[PDB]
From a paper:
We were able to obtain a co-crystal structure of hcLRS bound with a tavaborole derivative, a previous reported anti-cryptosporidium benzoxaborole, AN6426 (37). The structure was refined to 3.0 Å resolution. The IC50 of AN6426 to hcLRS in vitro is 7.7 μM. In the structure, AN6426-AMP is well accommodated in the editing pocket with the AN6426 moiety mainly binding to residues from the editing active site, such as Thr293, Thr298 and Asp399. The side chain of Lys 464 from the I4ae insertion is within the Van der Waals interaction distance with the ether group at the meta-C of AN6426. Structurally, this I4ae insertion makes the size of editing pocket from hcLRS much smaller than those from bacteria LRSs. One could imagine that if we added a bigger group to the meta-C of AN6426, this group will clash with the I4ae insertion of hcLRS. So it is theoretically feasible to design benzoxaborole-based derivatives with larger groups that will target bacteria LRSs but are too big for hcLRS. Taken together, our results showed that it is feasible to design benzoxaborole-based derivatives targeting specifically LRS from bacterial microbes but not hcLRS.
Numbering used by the authors: 7 to 118, 156 to 916, 932 to 1061
Amino acid sequence: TAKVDFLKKIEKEIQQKWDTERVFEVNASNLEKQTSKGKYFVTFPYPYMNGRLHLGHTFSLSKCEFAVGYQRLKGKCCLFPFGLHCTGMPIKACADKLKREIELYGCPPDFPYQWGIMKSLGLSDEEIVKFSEAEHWLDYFPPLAIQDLKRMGLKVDWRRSFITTDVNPYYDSFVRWQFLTLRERNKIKFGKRYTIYSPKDGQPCMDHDRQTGEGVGPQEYTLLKLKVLEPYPSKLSGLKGKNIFLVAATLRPETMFGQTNCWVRPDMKYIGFETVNGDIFICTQKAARNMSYQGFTKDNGVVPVVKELMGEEILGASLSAPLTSYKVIYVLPMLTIKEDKGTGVVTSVPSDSPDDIAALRDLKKKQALRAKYGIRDDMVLPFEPVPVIEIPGFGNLSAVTICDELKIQSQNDREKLAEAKEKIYLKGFYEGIMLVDGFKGQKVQDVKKTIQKKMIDAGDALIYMEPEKQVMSRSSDECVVALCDQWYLDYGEENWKKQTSQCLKNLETFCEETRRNFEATLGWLQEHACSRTYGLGTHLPWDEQWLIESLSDSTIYMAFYTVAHLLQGGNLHGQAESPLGIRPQQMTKEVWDYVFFKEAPFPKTQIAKEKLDQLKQEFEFWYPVDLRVSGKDLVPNHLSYYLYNHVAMWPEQSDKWPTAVRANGHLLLNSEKMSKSTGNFLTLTQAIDKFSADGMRLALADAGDTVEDANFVEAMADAGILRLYTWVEWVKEMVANWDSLRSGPASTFNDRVFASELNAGIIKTDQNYEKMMFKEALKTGFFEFQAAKDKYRELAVEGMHRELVFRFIEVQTLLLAPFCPHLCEHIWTLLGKPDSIMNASWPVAGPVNEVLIHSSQYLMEVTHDLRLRLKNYKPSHCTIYVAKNYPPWQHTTLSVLRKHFEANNGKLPDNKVIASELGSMPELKKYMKKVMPFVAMIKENLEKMGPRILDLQLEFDEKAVLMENIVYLTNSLELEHIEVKFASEAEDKIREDCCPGKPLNVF
Ligand SMILES: CCOc1ccc(Cl)c2c1[B@-]1(O[C@@H]3[C@H](O1)[C@@H](COP(=O)([O-])[O-])O[C@H]3n1cnc3c(N)ncnc31)O[C@@H]2CN
Ligand SMILES: CC(C)C[C@H](N)C(=O)NS(=O)(=O)OC[C@H]1O[C@@H](n2cnc3c(N)ncnc32)[C@H](O)[C@@H]1O
């Protein structure tokens, strides 16, 4: 427990040191003077402030945190800014939900929630009332996020932090300029479009204000109106003299020529309501709600209902249907009808729909269903399927044939009906050929929309838009599809889309899966409704009654990052003094044009030229954005809008378009979904309190470098804490006994081995950092680094070398610094370094000798084998025999393997061909049993450690390697003497079975 607290103590000390030193603050006026190795601009999509930051946010931003930590050692100057996204409706929604209980009840409120979740966050009874207003959220949560992040030690220039609502004047002016330019370039358009709409909120319901179906969009249905004829059914007697229609939903209008009846569910609650011209429609409450928000009613969102009934109350009614050859068709029941899809009313196409002929045959079979629901013989019997569409492999009556073949006799055969449905599922879309007059011999794909238009023009059909999948909003409202007027960004313009496609070609995606995601969302995207009326954000500068949603004021704010330090100077809300003395309102459209457009003319403003030139310098220096890391959930929405807006804002400058975007999966905690409802959920401040910042960052580095879901394990973090504490204690011990270390020329065998292993680790870890594979970087630059050091300490019989251990400590610290900068800074000052580790450079690797490394692996294997043989037959004297060359039979088989390897670019044939060729060689008579195990071992070690096992002699001196460590071998084996001999001296068994690299031994 005290180790975590020691880590936290060191962390707080070093954090205060960094703050006073002002190390991570960068200025373009000064950095542009000393040309170094370039700039590195990383961004994290600023998070929503409707709560505290948790572990997923920190895992996602850890990518660019470690990236800055590494890239600064390679000489570049880094810009890691951090904003806070307050725009949106959840903040205001929760504030108003809190005010609801504040005003309708008391403090505390009497029940029979929001106050409970606020108190669960540890707020005082008297301090939750202040949260009835959103401004208190804006004053409360952003400072806590900043505090936690600073406590994590992010290499962030906090002077460039800001807030995103109109409360911030500077960001407000920035978004004003952005959308003014967008509308000036014909990117924003006012129009009436279809959109997922929240009735309780009164505005479109986009991706980040939903709770179910993150990307689900509307779906189109052909809505047939079947007129009800007199004599009306009983329940509709009160609606005499008016026009009554059954509104059936369908997805295949071209089939309506073969209608025989109409299916309703007898146990469903159907609603008859009045439309815009006074007619009466019969559907369900949800269908009517959607139609009312699609202009089907006199008032938007008002459904004047004039009758409620059950499906049984409609059975037997007489209908007149379009297109069909039957002049009067009847309403009949069907048991299997979904209440989530359509209008609850289905048309009957018995020729090409399996469910229809199934239900019709069930009604034609027994009088039980006809008398249970009141169906006489005129409503079912004189109705036969009508040939309309012919599939070549089935005929004019496809459903009839495939349901006679699958031997179905009921409408409740879910499996058989699903199979018959999928068999002819799409074979009607393309290969169908019409048969009715006016369309004989036509491709169904070539006539379906024409017949739909035919029915819509004659007033016999309409267009009904319903959510494809069920959608739920943040405010617990079930959304509809509304055809409403709004301002939208025109992401469907072919020119804009092709330019963004080129930008995607130029963009760096660390895997092809993300490129495919981008291609799909680029081919699928169209108009994007961007206007809200309820919530926080920035108003349209010309339509002050509309606000701008959260997914649209966040497209090019990275440009605002480059000047936020000179505009508002660290004060989040932008309410403090300006460092350059620029008033919040003084930033006009032309001023922003001059700042962000290189070829823009200097306008007439009271601002001095030096200030605006400094701003333009900052922008043109820091741009473009090199890297942007995020979760794979922001690819279908935010990142595509980001590419689009960068293309539209700087259309002549592809060099200002984003460079790279790295996406990761979502974080699991202890291999389980992280959620507050299940128990496992860590916020950033909780995680720091529990594991220290460096321990948390270490366990975060090992989480996951793929796009598959990442795994944060607590036990791994605890083990990392233990290892960090032991490492710091080891460093302290070594600094204490500086004079107890061997010095001079480091010439011993293990000195050279360890030098080469250290350099190879430097090279491998540099590589793994370049690929942002931080798990592999931690593997090669810490765990395996420490394993090499432990082997070096264990094998150094004459004690470790002074300069070599100093170099190992220096380099291990320089490698670990991007993961654990606090511990590394502390150990840096422990070594007596003059400057901070934040000024260091990436360590230079020396020469790497593969022969030494392979020999050390050999010695490891030999020692493991010796200790395993020590298990059985009190020992005191051992003798090892080492073969200088392979014995004759082994040499012959290995020469055959070498020949075959040389034949075809290093592929060894099947052991069958090998055994044949070796059984054809006369010398190999006494050895055919021993042959194939040799080939098996050779293939295993070829797959394991390269083709070097095909060498006829080891690349290094085997006996000399053993002699360099005879002392250690004798000590660790608890023996008195070890005799290393050249195999030729041994007896017959050993001399015959010994081979180089596999030396034998006997006690
Ligand atoms: C896929 C089989 O659909 C076919 C297949 C062949 C033919 Cl010829 C047709 C249809 B289809 O009937 C409607 C509509 O198109 C189709 C809509 O599919 P989805 O399950 O609601 O997603 O199901 C039917 N449907 C619509 N609402 C329904 C509901 N609430 N319950 C059950 N079925 C419904 O139109 C014609 C005449 N029936
Ligand atoms: C620019 C604007 C339109 C974006 C908007 N402000 C926003 O999205 N704010 S946010 O707090 O929900 O997320 C911000 C970043 O943190 C990642 N992330 C979030 N949760 C998890 C998780 N459970 N697991 C893994 N990563 C996660 C997420 O992808 C994103 O890059």
